[PDB]
């Protein structure tokens, strides 16, 4: 307390200093999206505002007299107008093709720069940019499943040399199916963490849209954007939202959604080659999927995430009880035997609830009795709401 | 509807004008009223009358997509109207069920759930008008949801005379019209 008076004097002087420092340094405000003044190259911006002129985005439609020395280009300037223009002197004639987006000026509308194809911002955000914090070491009881998943979606990209030499075309699709909590998305999250190619996450509910032809359109732009990369991965979590089997119920039952599935089926295996995309589908209801989608060439590998066995459940218990402050003699083999048909999600809850019984008792170490009570609360007491009994019939 | 006027007054007028009466009594102020009866019995007439007499803004929520631009450009959930209701407090939010499941009764639940304890501003009452009370969802019929249910029976011989007297005042009537006989000539009729 003898320094309480001296603390506030230097604290207030400090707070006055930051307020003083920010006065000369600047960076106050940001509501208009202003960068800190240390990054202001105002000399270049003034030149940029003059030397670099703005360019209107237009789409080339038809090239007239491409063979001759006077090739005229018809452009569609979005909602503005249509113009027959010629190329600029700084762009090669072979760099502009019909149907591609171009940048045109506001005076003579001459094409100045070819542009990337238009892609829905929603589809762009569907690509993964921060890899998840899940590795293959966090998945227990899925050894054989994981090798099959890696050798299709991870190995060919990592070491492509061992497939071209033998004339091998690796499978370009994997379907992960199993009851909820079995680890379908967990293994996919492990794939994204390890993969170095582009990973796109698609949820089947994201492909359901208000207007007619959107879900097919978003699939088209999804694969169009995936094809602009040397290697790509598309994850379709809960494909059964749009992957349901086609049917005719008199009325237009699920006609629009079926078209979205048909477009996805067309991109996977149609007239045109798909590219270097390896798709990954996860669903807890594989019985509802369309037969054409469940066909090799679209879903070549069908990896089943069945309920873990005794060895697998013991492995999952160790994974989730790795960081627990457990006792010395916790019989995890016994715990795995007390939940015969239990998902890995239940085992995680058992581990979490086991520490909850100890935290409730103000104990810093969870005994084996807490895990025994956790199994009764999770595996037994919560067995009324278990999704396993109904979903094993679907898988 | 003298009995109905008194019933709706203690539920919509007293909480707005005199919140201290309920605080002294130790009861929560009413927030949901249900007016049920045959069509044309005056449910909308009374609900509008209270809002006119207590200076409470009267908002009719028909669920029409024509008025959706005024409620808000979002239009995803019906509680977006609460922004306009708070700005005009005290407010009376009225939905009439013309009579799938009833959207008016669905809107009742969404508005009543917000008004339970999740609404900060007070003096926002809500009313439903329905033809029958036995068709209501069990969620609305649950005690504590609707604070008072007011019945609007078809006018009897004396009430029909009062209604006949009210509307005939807007006409050039010859002296000596026996409106009592005319009321007797309309058994089981609405207002």
């Amino acid at each position: 307390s003898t320094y309480s008076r001296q603390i506030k004097q230097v604290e207030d002087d400090i707070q006055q200093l930051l307020k003083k420092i920010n006065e000369l340094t600047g960076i106050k405000e940001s509501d208009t999206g202003l960068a800190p003044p240390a990054l202001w190259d105002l000399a270049a911006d003034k030149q940029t505002l003059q030397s670099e002129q703005p360019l209107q985005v237009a789409r080339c439609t038809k090239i007239i007299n491409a063979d001759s020395e006077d090739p005229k280009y018809i452009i569609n300037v979005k909602q503005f107008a249509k113009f027959v223009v010629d190329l600029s002197d700084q762009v090669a004639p072979t760099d502009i093709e019909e149907g591609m987006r171009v940048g045109v000026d506001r005076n003579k509308y001459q094409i100045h720069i070819p542009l990337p194809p238009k892609i829905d911002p929603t589809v762009t955000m569907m690509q993964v940019e921060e890899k998840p914090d899940v590795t293959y070491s966090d998945v227990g009881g899925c050894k054989e499943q994981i090798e099959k998943l890696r050798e299709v979606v991870e190995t060919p990209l990592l070491h492509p040399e061992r497939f071209v030499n033998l004339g091998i075309e690796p499978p370009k699709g994997v379907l992960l199916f199993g009851p909820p909590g079995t680890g379908k998305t967990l293994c996919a999250r492990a794939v994204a963490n390890r993969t170095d190619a582009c990973f796109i996450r698609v949820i089947g509910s994201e492909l359901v849209q208000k207007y007619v032809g959107e879900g097919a359109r978003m699939v088209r732009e999804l694969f169009e954007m995936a094809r602009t990369k040397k290697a790509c991965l598309i994850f379709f979590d809960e494909i059964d939202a749009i992957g349901g089997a086609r049917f005719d119920d008199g009325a237009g039952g699920d006609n629009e959604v079926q078209r979205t599935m048909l477009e996805l089926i067309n991109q996977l295996d149609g007239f045109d080659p798909r590219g270097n995309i390896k798709v990954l589908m996860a669903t807890n209801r594989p019985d509802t999927l369309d037969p054409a989608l469940m066909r090799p060439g679209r879903l070549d590998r069908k990896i089943e995430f069945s309920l873990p066995d005794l060895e697998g459940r013991t492995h999952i218990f160790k994974i989730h009880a790795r960081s627990m402050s457990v006792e010395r003699d916790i019989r995890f083999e016994l715990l795995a035997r007390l939940c015969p048909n239990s998902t890995g999600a239940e085992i995680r809850s058992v581990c979490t609830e086991a520490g909850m019984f100890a935290i409730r008792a103000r104990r810093k170490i969870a005994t084996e009795k807490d895990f025994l009570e956790a199994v009764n609360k999770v595996i037994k007491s919560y067995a009324k709401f278990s999704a396993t009994p109904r979903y094993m019939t679907y898988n | 509807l003298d009995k109905q006027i008194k019933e709706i007054k203690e539920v919509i007028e007293l909480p707005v004008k005199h919140p201290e009466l309920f605080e002294a009594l130790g009861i929560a102020q009413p927030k949901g009223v249900l007016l049920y009866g045959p069509p044309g019995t005056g449910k909308t007439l009374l609900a509008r009358a209270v809002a006119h007499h207590t200076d409470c803004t009267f908002i009719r929520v028909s669920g029409s997509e024509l008025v959706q631009k005024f409620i808000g450009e979002g239009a995803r959930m019906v509680r977006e109207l609460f922004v306009m209701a708070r700005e005009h407090a005290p407010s009376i939010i009225f939905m009439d069920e013309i009579d799938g499941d009833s959207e008016v009764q669905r809107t009742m639940l969404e508005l009543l759930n917000q008004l339970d304890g999740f609404e900060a501003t007070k003096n926002i009452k809500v009313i439903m008008a329905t033809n029958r009370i036995d068709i209501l969802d069990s969620a609305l019929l649950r005690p504590g949801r609707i604070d008072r249910k007011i019945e609007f029976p078809p006018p009897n011989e004396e009430a029909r005379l009062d209604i006949l007297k009210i509307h005939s005042r807007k006409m050039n009537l010859t002296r000596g019209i026996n409106l009592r006989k005319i009321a007797e000539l309309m058994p089981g009729a609405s207002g």
Partner: protein
């Protein structure tokens, strides 16, 4: 549901038969060992409350004086199978004046399994498989014999078979300890060692059952004093 009881999976599995097999993993662990000196049957009672009398939990059943059965899974379902076994036996004795072979007794009980149906069945016919695995053990002309039965009606002679919740763990331990030429005392001791390691509780003379069928001797239920003698070692 839409599915009937007699429905085949796309993999050729009878759905109700496989589901009844999963019921055994919820039952108590039973260990049976076949030895030239006799057949030993061990099972855990799984006491769930101190007030419950352990004597009432009969999971080893005298089928006859020369054959005994250990049960795991749904105990209530095994009563029908046990009663038929105790009726089929003493029916062979009535007609042939001899003790039925252990294989024949297991075969007769096995025929009861899969005799379940929904339509075109007798009023007394069963509706679902028997979710209990049986471990028949006894002595006959072929000497001591141990047979394992499953809800699928598949019976097979086993040198040392463990059924129940810890069947996977106990069977692996059984293979590490079983040799063809050993004594019954080792078989009893080894079964108790394996059981003690797999039980949730602590092994004592009141939460387990031990049965032996020796040649010459009859089916014998191990008492508490007899159980304490072998438990006191391990």
């Amino acid at each position: 549901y839409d599915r009937g009881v007699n429905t085949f999976s796309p993999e050729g599995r009878l759905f109700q038969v496989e589901y009844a097999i999963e019921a055994i993993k919820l039952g108590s662990t039973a260990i049976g060992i076949q030895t030239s000196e006799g057949v030993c049957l061990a099972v855990e009672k799984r006491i769930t409350s101190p007030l419950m009398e352990p004597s009432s939990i009969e999971k080893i059943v005298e089928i006859d004086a020369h054959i005994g059965c250990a049960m795991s899974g749904l105990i209530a379902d095994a009563k029908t199978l046990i009663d038929k076994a105790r009726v089929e036996t003493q029916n062979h004795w009535f007609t042939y004046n001899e003790t039925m072979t252990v294989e024949s007794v297991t075969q007769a009980v096995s025929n009861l399994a899969l005799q379940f149906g929904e339509e075109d069945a007798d009023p007394g016919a069963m509706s679902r498989p028997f979710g209990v695995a049986l471990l028949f053990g006894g002595v006959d002309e072929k000497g001591p014999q141990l047979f394992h039965m499953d809800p699928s009606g598949t019976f097979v002679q086993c040198d040392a078979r463990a059924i129940g919740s810890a069947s996977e763990g106990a069977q692996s331990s059984l293979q590490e300890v079983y040799h063809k030429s050993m004594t019954l005392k080792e078989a009893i001791k080894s079964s108790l060692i394996i059981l003690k390691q797999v039980m949730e509780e602590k092994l004592n003379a009141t939460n387990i059952e031990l049965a032996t069928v020796q040649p010459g001797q009859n089916f014998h239920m191990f008492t508490k004093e007899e159980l304490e003698e072998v438990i006191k070692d391990i």
